[PDB]
Amino acid sequence: GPPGPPGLPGEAGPPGPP
Amino acid sequence: GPPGPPGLPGEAGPPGPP
Amino acid sequence: GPPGPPGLPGEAGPPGPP
């Protein structure tokens, strides 16, 4: 069989500096 | 054959811009 | 037939909010 599909993207990162 | 299982999720992204 | 290899982990997530 083919390799499985790539994982989902991670969640968005932390808010940036103020 | 059948596709393997999907990959694990990616890690969290980078901090946003200031 | 024989199952394929597990998929690669996902990309890092998008940048966070400002």
Q: Chains with ≥3 Cβ pairs under 8 A against A?
A: B, C
Q: Considering only CB atoms, which chain C residues are within 8 Å of A15?
A: 16-18
Nearest to C17 by CA among B14, B8, A9, B2: B14
Answer whether C10's CB lies under 8 Å from A9's CB: yes
The residue behind tokens 């982990």 is C9
CB A9 within 8 A of CB B8: no
Phi-psi group of C2: left, alpha or beta (phi > 0 → left; psi -120 to 50 → alpha; rest → beta):
beta
**How close does chain B come to A11, measured CA to CA in Å?**
5
Q: Entry resolution in angstroms?
A: 1.7
The CB-side HSE value for A5 (13 A sphere, CA atoms) comes to 5
